[PDB]
Amino acid sequence: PTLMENGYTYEDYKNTAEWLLSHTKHRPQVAIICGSGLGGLTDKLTQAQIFDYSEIPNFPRSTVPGHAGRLVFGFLNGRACVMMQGRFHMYEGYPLWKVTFPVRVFHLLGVDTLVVTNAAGGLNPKFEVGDIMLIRDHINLPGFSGQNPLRGPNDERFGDRFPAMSDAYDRTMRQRALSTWKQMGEQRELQEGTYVMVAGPSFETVAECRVLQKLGADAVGMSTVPEVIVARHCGLRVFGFSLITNKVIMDYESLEKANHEEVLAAGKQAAQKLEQFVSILMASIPLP
Amino acid sequence: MENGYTYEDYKNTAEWLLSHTKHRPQVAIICGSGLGGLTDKLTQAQIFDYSEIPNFPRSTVPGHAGRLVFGFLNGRACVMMQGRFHMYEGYPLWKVTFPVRVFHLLGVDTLVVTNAAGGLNPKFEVGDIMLIRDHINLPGFSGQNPLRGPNDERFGDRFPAMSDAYDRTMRQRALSTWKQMGEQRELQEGTYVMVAGPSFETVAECRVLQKLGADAVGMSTVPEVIVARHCGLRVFGFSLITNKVIMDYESLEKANHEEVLAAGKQAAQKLEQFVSILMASIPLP
Amino acid sequence: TLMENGYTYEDYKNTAEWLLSHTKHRPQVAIICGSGLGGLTDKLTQAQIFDYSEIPNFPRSTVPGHAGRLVFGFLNGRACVMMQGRFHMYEGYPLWKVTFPVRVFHLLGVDTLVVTNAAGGLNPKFEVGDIMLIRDHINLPGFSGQNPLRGPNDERFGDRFPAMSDAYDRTMRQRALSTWKQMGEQRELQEGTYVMVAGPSFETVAECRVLQKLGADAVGMSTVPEVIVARHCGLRVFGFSLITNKVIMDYESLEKANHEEVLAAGKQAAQKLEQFVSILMASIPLP
Ligand SMILES: Nc1nc2c(CN3C[C@H](CO)[C@@H](O)C3)c[nH]c2c(=O)[nH]1
Numbered sequence: 001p002t003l004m005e006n007g008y009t010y011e012d013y014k015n016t017a018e019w020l021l022s023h024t025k026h027r028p029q030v031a032i033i034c035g036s037g038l039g040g041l042t043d044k045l046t047q048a049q050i051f052d053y054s055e056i057p058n059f060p061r062s063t064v065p066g067h068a069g070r071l072v073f074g075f076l077n078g079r080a081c082v083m084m085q086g087r088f089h090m091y092e093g094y095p096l097w098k099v100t101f102p103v104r105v106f107h108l109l110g111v112d113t114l115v116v117t118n119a120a121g122g123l124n125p126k127f128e129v130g131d132i133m134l135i136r137d138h139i140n141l142p143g144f145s146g147q148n149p150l151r152g153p154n155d156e157r158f159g160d161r162f163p164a165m166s167d168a169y170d171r172t173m174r175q176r177a178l179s180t181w182k183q184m185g186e187q188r189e190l191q192e193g194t195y196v197m198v199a200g201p202s203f204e205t206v207a208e209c210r211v212l213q214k215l216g217a218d219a220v221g222m223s224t225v226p227e228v229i230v231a232r233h234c235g236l237r238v239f240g241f242s243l244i245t246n247k248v249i250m251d252y253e254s255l256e257k258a259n260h261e262e263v264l265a266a267g268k269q270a271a272q273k274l275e276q277f278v279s280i281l282m283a284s285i286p287l288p
Numbered sequence: 289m290e291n292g293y294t295y296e297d298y299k300n301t302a303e304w305l306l307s308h309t310k311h312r313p314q315v316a317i318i319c320g321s322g323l324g325g326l327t328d329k330l331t332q333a334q335i336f337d338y339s340e341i342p343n344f345p346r347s348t349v350p351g352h353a354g355r356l357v358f359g360f361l362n363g364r365a366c367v368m369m370q371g372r373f374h375m376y377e378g379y380p381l382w383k384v385t386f387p388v389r390v391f392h393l394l395g396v397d398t399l400v401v402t403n404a405a406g407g408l409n410p411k412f413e414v415g416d417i418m419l420i421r422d423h424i425n426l427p428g429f430s431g432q433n434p435l436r437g438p439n440d441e442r443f444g445d446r447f448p449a450m451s452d453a454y455d456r457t458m459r460q461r462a463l464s465t466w467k468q469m470g471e472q473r474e475l476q477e478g479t480y481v482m483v484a485g486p487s488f489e490t491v492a493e494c495r496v497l498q499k500l501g502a503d504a505v506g507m508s509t510v511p512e513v514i515v516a517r518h519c520g521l522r523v524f525g526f527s528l529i530t531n532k533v534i535m536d537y538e539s540l541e542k543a544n545h546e547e548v549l550a551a552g553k554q555a556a557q558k559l560e561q562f563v564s565i566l567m568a569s570i571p572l573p
Numbered sequence: 574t575l576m577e578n579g580y581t582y583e584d585y586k587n588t589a590e591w592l593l594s595h596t597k598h599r600p601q602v603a604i605i606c607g608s609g610l611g612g613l614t615d616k617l618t619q620a621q622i623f624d625y626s627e628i629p630n631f632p633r634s635t636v637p638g639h640a641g642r643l644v645f646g647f648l649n650g651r652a653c654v655m656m657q658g659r660f661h662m663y664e665g666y667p668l669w670k671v672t673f674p675v676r677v678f679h680l681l682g683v684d685t686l687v688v689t690n691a692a693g694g695l696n697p698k699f700e701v702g703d704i705m706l707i708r709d710h711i712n713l714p715g716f717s718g719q720n721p722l723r724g725p726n727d728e729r730f731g732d733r734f735p736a737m738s739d740a741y742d743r744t745m746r747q748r749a750l751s752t753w754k755q756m757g758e759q760r761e762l763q764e765g766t767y768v769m770v771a772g773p774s775f776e777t778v779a780e781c782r783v784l785q786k787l788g789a790d791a792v793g794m795s796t797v798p799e800v801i802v803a804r805h806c807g808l809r810v811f812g813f814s815l816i817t818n819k820v821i822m823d824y825e826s827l828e829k830a831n832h833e834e835v836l837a838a839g840k841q842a843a844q845k846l847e848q849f850v851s852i853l854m855a856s857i858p859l860p
Pocket residue numbers: 036089118119120121122198200203204220221222223245246248258259260263447
């Protein structure tokens with residue numbers, strides 16, 4: 001009982017992959033994880049098939065609202081997709097080996113690209129709510145201290161022992177998302193910066209917000225990084241963005257408080273603009 | 289994963305207390321290392337051993353008596369933790385903070401937390417009292433947070449805010465009321481950074497902690513605060529700066545608990561006077 | 574439900590006695606050899622080799638370039654025991670297993686521990702192949718729970734609350750520094766802060782920026798727990814890194830840190846390492 005490794009065996013991921021393949025004719029190339037209140041990104045998929053997480057062997061469940069807890073296969077702008085409508089978080093009590101389960105089943109499914117979205121608190125002063133931020137890079141604070149989904153024995157059928165994360169955010173797609181933005185009719189620029197992961201479930205104090213700023217983080221949240229780390233370890237291309245849902249309180253004067261109701265509501269507002277952005281992006285994702 | 293205590297556990301404990309004392313506290317006071325001497329002014333004091341009270345962890349560090357004391361302090365109905373619990377003892381934060389949810393079930397509506405702290409701000413001297421204006425939860429950042437796991441709505445919200453954590457009224461009130469202490473040392477206010485220990489900082493660590501903007505360092509307090517706010521208790525916090533953390537390589541001085549307890553003892557009368565004035569500052573239910 | 578050392582005092586004693594029974598060596602100095610640094614055992618004389626698998630209670634090393642062997646012998650005429658490879662948190666080990674050998678080294682009679690490691694270079698002044706002497710460390714896993722001393726403290730080993738501000742011996746530093754002018758080079762000995770990070774995956778550019786701005790000169794994934802328990806039981810401690818690679822600092826670079834080049838830089842550094850370690854041995858005080 002000493003060793004802290006994955007509770008999931010390789011054949012565990014396999015069983016789930018298989019089950020999915022025997023239960024849908026869809027064969028996705030792109031997997032999309034929808035953050036808090038962003039569950040609306042599945043609206044535009046055609047010929048859609050829905051599975052409740054409860055149906056899928058080994059799948060965790062979403063306990064936080066509104067993470068719908070459903071897996072959805074569809075086409076989006078020429079491309080076969082699978083979408084996580086709701087994700088999992090460390091703060092819910094899950095070990096990162098659970099949080100990230102689906103990612104390696106996508107790989108066994110044959111997905112070669114993963115897009116990750118999340119709600120995120122604004123740390124950079126010139127962001128505004130409703131801004132989409134292209135995740136250039138992240139800072140894995142839980143990672144530094146030992147909280148990493150890769151911890152334990154490493155299966156080379158999936159990846160290396162020491163996989164480099166410094167090219168994690170696909171540079172090609174950044175450049176393409178950038179100029180693709182001049183193609184939407186938008187007032188605000190597409191935002192770019194570093195996402196810092198923090199465990200939660202409680203929200204930053206003012207001093208904490210200030211370390212995070214000092215650290216160089218542009219946005220804070222409690223997800224996403226584990227998933228990126230396991231994706232890149234199996235060689236998926238990774239592309240991420242955060243929806244800026246609130247500016248995290250950076251002075252003792254404010255009487256504003258960060259809260260879930262407000263973040264879910266910044267999500268419903270933007271999901272429209274979001275889905276379109278994701279839509280045009282699909283035709284930018286490189287073919288297998 | 290999850291908190292090992294069911295809701296009934298906290299209830300059992302509260303009811304045990306509610307039927308073994310007639311005291312009904314409004315304020316709960318957690319006593320840090322060398323601050324155990326603050327139960328001394330409790331009138332009509334009633335004392336329990338942590339080992340009597342169902343589900344109570346034990347205090348295993350010297351300077352932590354392992355005793356729960358109900359009484360009145362400068363008129364106010366208090367219950368005091370004479371000794372506390374740390375993460376480095378091998379306790380999950382859901383044990384470290386356990387009493388706090390119980391106090392809430394007792395009807396306590398205010399929590400004061402006290403600790404010893406190392407001084408990061410060069411302006412601080414041993415003996416100072418630093419009001420906890422804010423904290424940095426370094427262990428929180430990576431998963432060690434007492435709220436981790438399923439949330440019980442009966443206590444609070446899945447995502448509670450912490451930027452309002454330390455009552456601005458009670459701090460400002462404490463700041464003005466400080467001239468009654470007859471002191472020449474000003475009253476300090478700054479940031480507490482929790483660090484898990486049990487080993488003391490390197491010079492290099494001291495320096496990250498400084499440049500992270502923190503004024504004092506300890507290994508306690510933050511989890512308790514977090515769960516108190518989760519259930520809506522008013523929170524006041526202060527630190528006794530017991531040592532100045534080592535910030536250069538040519539000093540031959542080094543942090544030790546003995547110096548910590550020694551400085552606790554030195555300031556025992558000044559704390560007691562300060563905490564007394566503080567009971568006059570808490571709003572009534 | 575208590576996070577706690579899984580080893581009793583008796584376990585550390587069972588292991589130490591076993592070594593004492595099976596070897597005639599009585600080591601004064603213990604050396605932990607990191608990734609790709611195994612060849613430091615080469616210059617040991619009258620050597621005797623134990624596979625970790627033979628040693629009661631010894632963990633095993635699963636990373637490549639960590640041989641998994643305990644080697645006794647003399648080096649520059651000093652009685653050493655060398656760990657041929659070590660253990661890391663990322664392997665799934667609790668810090669109380671990672672550092673297990675150190676207390677047994679202590680029960681063996683060892684009074685000095687020298688920790689060695691590979692490290693990514695953070696300080697722009699460092700070249701691949703430099704030896705940075707660890708003047709100090711930053712213990713990030715320690716900041717948030719991960720410390721080998723967590724749980725009940727055994728007072729037979731040391732304090733409930735030990736100081737680390739003096740962890741790396743000043744006198745050994747200075748002696749090592751001034752002794753460097755011989756089989757020295759046009760390249761100086763480096764000195765600086767090791768930051769420990771858990772891994773197993775390598776730093777992003779952003780993470781690399783936070784480490785730099787935290788004051789840290791080199792990054793690795795071990796060592797610090799070993800140092801903490803060494804000082805717990807009052808061993809003199811000396812540390813150094815081999816800068817095996819420069820951590821990626823900007824987004825257009827196409828280089829990526831990889832294990833293979835960590836090990837290569839090690840084999841490339843063997844001779845200079847050998848020379849240094851034995852010049853170090855001369856700088857270690859006698860009982
Ligand atoms: N840590 C943090 N996370 C977020 C998020 C992202 N998630 C939103 C949800 C809480 O509303 C958690 O799952 C984290 C939005 N804003 C913030 C913030 O200010 N802070």
